[PDB]
């Protein structure tokens, strides 16, 4: 499951939305571009800009 607690979206049709929340070692299953801190363990964000927000988690 890909979820997202912190979501962000530009006001526009359609909107580009990024997910700001930050995981360790890797991004969620449906993240194309994943950008992590070079360090163990690693702080990974998903920089994808999809045009809808995923739902929260847990």
Swiss-Prot record:
Keywords linked to the UniProt accession: Disulfide bond, Protease inhibitor, Serine protease inhibitor, Signal
An annotated Gene Ontology molecular function: serine-type endopeptidase inhibitor activity
Site residues, Reactive bond for chymotrypsin: 38-39
One cellular component term from this protein's GO annotations in UniProt: extracellular region
Transmembrane regions: none
The family this protein is said to belong to: Belongs to the Bowman-Birk serine protease inhibitor family.
UniProt name for this protein: Bowman-Birk type proteinase inhibitor
Record organism: Glycine max (Soybean)
Keyword Signal: yes
Function: Inhibitor of trypsin and of chymotrypsin.
Disulphide-bonded residues: 3-57, 4-19, 7-53, 9-17, 27-34, 31-46, 36-44
Keyword Disulfide bond: yes
Boundaries of the shown chain within the full protein: 45 to 102 of 110
Annotated site location: Reactive bond for trypsin: 11-12
């Amino acid at each position: 499951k890909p979820c997202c607690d912190q979501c962000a979206c530009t006001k526009s049709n359609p909107p580009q939305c990024r997910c700001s929340d930050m995981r360790l070692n890797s991004c969620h299953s449906a993240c194309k571009s994943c950008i992590c801190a070079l360090s163990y363990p690693a702080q990974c964000f998903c920089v994808d800009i999809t045009d809808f927000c995923y739902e929260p988690c847990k």
